[PDB]
Design a protein around this nucleic acid. Sequence first.
DNA 1: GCCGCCCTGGAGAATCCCGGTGCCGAGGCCGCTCAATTGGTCGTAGACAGCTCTAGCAACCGCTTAAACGCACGTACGCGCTGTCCCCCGCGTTTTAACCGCCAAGGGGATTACTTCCTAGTCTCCAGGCACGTGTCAGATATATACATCC
Length: 49
Amino acid sequence: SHLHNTWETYESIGQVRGLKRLDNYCKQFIIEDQQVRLDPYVTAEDIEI
DNA sequence: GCCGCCCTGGAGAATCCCGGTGCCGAGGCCGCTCAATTGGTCGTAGACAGCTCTAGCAACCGCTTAAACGCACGTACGCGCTGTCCCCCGCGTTTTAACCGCCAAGGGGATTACTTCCTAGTCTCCAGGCACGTGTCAGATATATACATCC
């Protein structure tokens, strides 16, 4: 019900359904966020949008 | 004497069934309407008969000879088993475009009716192209006869 949202960890999850969604979120968000943070070819407009 | 708790009865509301009435799919009925029917006439397609000549057919012959058949051997290939690895399938997740519903105007094309004229059918006459047969002629082929030569 979006009120029982839990702050979890990979070892705290174990093996449940939807772990591929967690892997996809981790890969996309973390990899692309640190890519746009660490790239020197990033303007101020891109980082603020 | 006063106050709180457990047991049981009749009235108010929800649901199933039936009857009256309105709406969707299909069939009977009516009206147009054009194509099938009927009746008559005539030309000709085809049936029938007749004669001639050639191919086929049943059953036999005889001869030749090459193909078919039988047999032995051998070995190459079909097939079965095993390994392996790789690639396709199943599944979960994310994207994306098919699908449906919308403009906005305009052209293409299917009908209905009408006009016109060019071109193809039809008829008559004629002539030349096609089919068949034959005389003749030049190229190809085989041998007759004369000259140089080896033993």
